[PDB]
Amino acid sequence: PMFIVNTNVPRASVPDGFLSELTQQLAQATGKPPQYIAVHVVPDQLMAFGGSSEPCALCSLHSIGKIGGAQNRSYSKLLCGLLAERLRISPDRVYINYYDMNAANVGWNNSTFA
Amino acid sequence: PMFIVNTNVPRASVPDGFLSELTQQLAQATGKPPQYIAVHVVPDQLMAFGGSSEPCALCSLHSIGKIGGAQNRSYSKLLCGLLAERLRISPDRVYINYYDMNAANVGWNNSTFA
Amino acid sequence: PMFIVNTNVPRASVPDGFLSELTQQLAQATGKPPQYIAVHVVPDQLMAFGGSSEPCALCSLHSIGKIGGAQNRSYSKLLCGLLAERLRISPDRVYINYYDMNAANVGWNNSTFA
């Protein structure tokens, strides 16, 4: 799985250990070894949510499997919770796009997962 | 809806009221309350279009519905128009990827839109 | 086609000519005319792969067609090869998401490719 967070929160407000915490929590939430988890945090972004420059985040979670209605609700609770606790972003100022990828459409290590 | 623009145009060339203008214009164009519109502009990017590094832009518009053949042509005229007028990017150096997201695949406020 | 690389490798380690090489090699691999190829490289990123902050990359290739099982395997070999040779990123620390875009969902030059 791959999780990307784009936010207007400044770099200095991203706490030490955040990428590792996201890796660990996503590994547990998806039921997959942490070796498969990639995380990417992009602070200091020029963005608005609802026309407001208050803290917000635009995120993506891509995975081969483990994406669906109930699972995505659970991921959203987990991830909004982390963004609220660690970056002080209100959950109603977060969008997370979920992508259920086919193995043939994910490249890695000179090939794909198909 | 969420609109992202990545561009090699420098940050100082992004007009002060650009995020607010994108928000209002996309609210009108999608027929959604502006409270739901997220906008994200990423200047100063290392990019090329056709092998050339004159001003260009790579963009995306994600929405739950309001995506389709004629609608996307209208969005493209609207958004290329704004990028040409405000950022001085030629319309033939802009790509906009459109994504019709299922509500169950969009997280927000600790849950999804399903 | 549009190819985006997001990497923790620093900007100074991206060689002169990298965008031009990606453009030409993507034209060679997809067969598409170079004038239609966009490339975007984002260095200095806060990211982890498998819990580790060693050099890594998260990438995407979007194309109207020219996406599929065998094609994506070939692109992964090519692109991991370039990332290894030019950015010193191990291929097993690269993910590439492949997207076959419908022409009606790609805006360009005030319209779409439909």
Is the Cβ–Cβ distance between B37 and B60 less than 8 Å?
A: no
What are residue B28's phi and psi, to 5 degrees?
A: -65, -45
Q: Among residues C64, C65, C86, C68, which one has the least CA distance to residue C76?
A: C68
Nearest 10 degrees: CA dihedral of B6, C53, A96, A103? 90
Is the Cβ–Cβ distance between B52 and A80 less than 8 Å?
A: no
Q: Catalytic positions of C, please? A: 1
The answer for residues whose C-beta is within 8 angstroms of residue A86's C-beta and 6 or more apart is A14, A15, A18, A21
The answer for residues whose C-beta is within 8 angstroms of residue A102's C-beta and 6 or more apart is A64, A114
Q: Which amino acid is at A102?
A: N
Residues on chain B touching C43 (C-beta within 8 angstroms): 46
CATH 3.40.190.10 applies to domain B1-114: no
Q: What is the DSSP pairing of strand B111-112 with strand B46-49?
A: unpaired
CA distance C49 to chain A (A): 4
Q: Among residues B94, B79, B4, which one has the least CA distance to residue B42?
A: B4
SS3 category, B39: strand
Residues on chain A touching C6 (C-beta within 8 angstroms): 4, 40
Give the resolution to one decimal, in Å: 1.3
- Chains in contact with A, where contact means 3 or more Cβ–Cβ distances below 8 Å, are B, C
Listed by start position, the domains of chain A span 1-114
SS3 category, A24: helix
Residue carrying the six token digits 């407001």:
A52
The two three-digit tokens of residue C76, written as one number: 């992964």
CA distance B16 to chain C (A): 24
Distance from C-alpha of B53 to C-alpha of B10, rounded to nearest angstrom: 12
Cβ–Cβ gap C69/A106 under 8 Å:
no
What are residue C94's phi and psi, to 5 degrees?
A: -130, 130
